[PDB]
Amino acid sequence: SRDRKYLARLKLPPLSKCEALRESLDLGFEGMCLEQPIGKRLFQQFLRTHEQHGPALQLWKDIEDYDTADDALRPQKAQALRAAYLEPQAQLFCSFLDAETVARARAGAGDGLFQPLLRAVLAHLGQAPFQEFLDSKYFLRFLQWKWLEAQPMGEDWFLDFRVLGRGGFGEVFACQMKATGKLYACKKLNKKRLKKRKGYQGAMVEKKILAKVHSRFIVSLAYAFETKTDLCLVMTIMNGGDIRYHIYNVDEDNPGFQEPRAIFYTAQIVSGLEHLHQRNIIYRDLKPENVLLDDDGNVRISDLGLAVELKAGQTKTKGYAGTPGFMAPELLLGEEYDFSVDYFALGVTLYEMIAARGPFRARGEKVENKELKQRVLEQAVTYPDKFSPASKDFCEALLQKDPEKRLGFRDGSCDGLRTHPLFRDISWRQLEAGMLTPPFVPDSRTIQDVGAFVAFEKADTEFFQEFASGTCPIPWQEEMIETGVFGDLNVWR
Ligand SMILES: Nc1ncnc2c1ncn2[C@@H]1O[C@H](COP(=O)(O)OP(=O)(O)OP(=O)(O)O)[C@@H](O)[C@H]1O
Ligand SMILES: [Cl-]
Ligand SMILES: [Mg+2]
């Protein structure tokens, strides 16, 4: 189940020890009470047991419920919400709202009703209620948790029990957090090998990006430490492995996906792309081999070592990186580029899910890289009849050789791409919240042995200590909640 010796080191400290922390933390409302899972829970208990804020809590909860409920149910839920909180003679009536918002909220509909009302409620909650919360026993308890979150939790706390895969710098293991029982993947990078092959920069960029981005469509970093021989990244476990295995290696006679399945994965990859592009990051390594699948049947993107973060007032970059057959014409030509290259590789990826072969070579054909580059620059793609009219069109709109014409990310978003007929039966709102059932669930399917193969300077040592930054806060708080430890220790008397 879990190790009693490591479970017994999760205990709340006496308050005296939490003094210093006050200075080191952001005590802003958005950052503490909305973005940190344990902060939100505690804030919500305060609002629940101080009953004058009761009307504001239940309106908050009923908006989130409306936002993620499915189409047929929404019309009735809107009517309920209006009546409960927005009629003057109602019991849970929200006086604190201003006359305009109150008025505007009681009329019409749309794909985002009550988004202005949700801002008005958070705006209110950030003033008096928040101020009183800081004077309460619940804020003090927040500090106890943030202290425990900061204690050292390195190599000794994880048990490796099986090999999941092999990368360029070492193995990736399935492992267990000893105190809570939770399962993760741990990717190992050999230090001596990283040095001789000049891979520091690629390793650091991947770790920086996986720490700061928080999306259900990209693998999440929970811990980063060092051992005497390796650097380690502990991250979301994806037990189904890569999407490419599933195209070719399961049904040999009849490879490829049915169309509804191919569309669903396409929609999840677009959301992850969007979360990268909103932060000015270019991925540069999208392919079936790097899209992974979990026990429930959802996917995420991985392998971020080829990525580039655009600096202040830079809109394009140069550089020859990627996998032949996935690199767009503008890149092959030596031009400057932006997000365009990611949307071409998305075209190649959908094509292969449906057809079980690439658009520029027959299945099991052998082509030297120089010939494959000429094909991408000049060849028209042909489409066999496994494609519908909609999926043919969508692929043509991404594989388009002129990036000025290609569909993708513009004016802050992928909302133009989302309206394509291909997606007509997909509920974007529900997909983004994690509440569609995937139309395939992983059935019965769950590594050959090989052997293994200069002192360091302070430059190397100091680089290793900077890489090994410790525990990421949002994922740690989730672990504590999911596994039941929050429930057992968050008690008073
Ligand atoms: N989060 C994960 N969950 C489960 N398995 C994983 C996970 N991450 C990686 N793996 C397995 O380990 C293999 C190598 O991982 P990864 O792509 O991160 O290596 P890499 O050395 O960065 O690859 P490349 O040299 O292609 O950039 C993957 O193909 C996959 O099978
Ligand atoms: Cl299928
Ligand atoms: Mg890599």
- DSSP letters, 111-133, are TTTTHHHHHHHHHHHTTHHHHHH
Residue entry with tokens 């996935």: 326
CB 137: neighbour CB atoms within 10 A?
11
Enumerate the H helices of 232-308 as residue ranges.
243-248, 259-277
The tokens describing 157, both together, are 């706390």
Residue 381 is given by DSSP the state P
In the block, residue with structure tokens 């048990």: 159
- The rounded distance, in Å, linking the Cα atoms of 44 and 141 is 13
Q: Which of 160, 187, 243 to mutate to test the pocket of ligand 1 (most atoms within 8 A of CB)?
A: 187
Q: What tokens were used for 293? A: 């699948």
Substitution site in 301, 302, 304 for ligand 1 pocket (most atoms within 8 Å of beta carbon): 302
Rounded Cα–Cα distance for residues 337 and 317 (Å): 6
Q: From the CB of 168, is ligand 1 less than 6 Å away?
A: yes
The 10 Å Cβ neighbour count of residue 365 is 10
Contact 125, 56 (CB under 8 A): yes
Strands 183-190 and 171-177, sheet pairing:
antiparallel
Angle at 33 between CA 32 and CA 38, to 5 degrees: 85
From the list 468, 434, 98, the residue with the least C-alpha distance to 271 is 434
Radius of gyration of the CA atoms of the chain, in A? 25
| Beta-carbon-side half-sphere exposure of residue 154 (alpha carbons within 13 Å) | 11
Altogether, the residues listed in the chain come to a count of: 493
Question: Which stretches of 157-259 are assigned E, i.e. beta strand?
Answer: 158-166, 171-177, 183-190, 221-226, 230-235, 241-242
Q: Judging by beta carbons within 10 Å of its beta carbon (0-12, 13-18, 19+), is residue 103 exposed, middle or buried?
A: exposed
DSSP-assigned beta bridge partners for residue 166: 171
Task: Tell me the C-alpha to C-alpha distance, in Å, between residue 330 and each of 273, 322, 336, 401, 413.
Answer: 19, 13, 8, 8, 22
Q: How far apart are the first and last CA of the chain?
A: 29
Please give the Cα distance from 403 to 398 (Å, whole number). Answer: 9
Contact 483/4 with Cβ under 8 angstroms? no
* Alpha-helix runs per DSSP H in 339-382: 340-355, 369-378
Return phi, psi of residue 364, to 5°: 55, 50
322 CB near ligand 1 (under 6 Å)? no
Neighbouring residues of 55: CB distance < 8 A, sequence distance ≥ 6: 85, 92, 93, 94
> How many angstroms separate the CA atoms of 261 and 26, rounded?
43
* Separation in Å, CA 122 to CA 107, 116, 117, 139, 255: 21, 10, 9, 18, 50
Which are the contacts of 209, defined by CB distance < 8 A and separation ≥ 6? 281, 304, 307, 309
Domains of the chain: 1-150+446-493 (1.10.167.10), 151-241 (3.30.200.20), 242-445 (1.10.510.10)
Q: What gap in Å lies between CA 204 and CA 233, rounded to an integer?
A: 11
Pocket flag, ligand 1, residue 475 (CB < 6 Å): no
d(CA 27, CA 35): 12
Residue 167 Cα to ligand 3 middle (Å): 7
**DSSP category for residue 157:** G
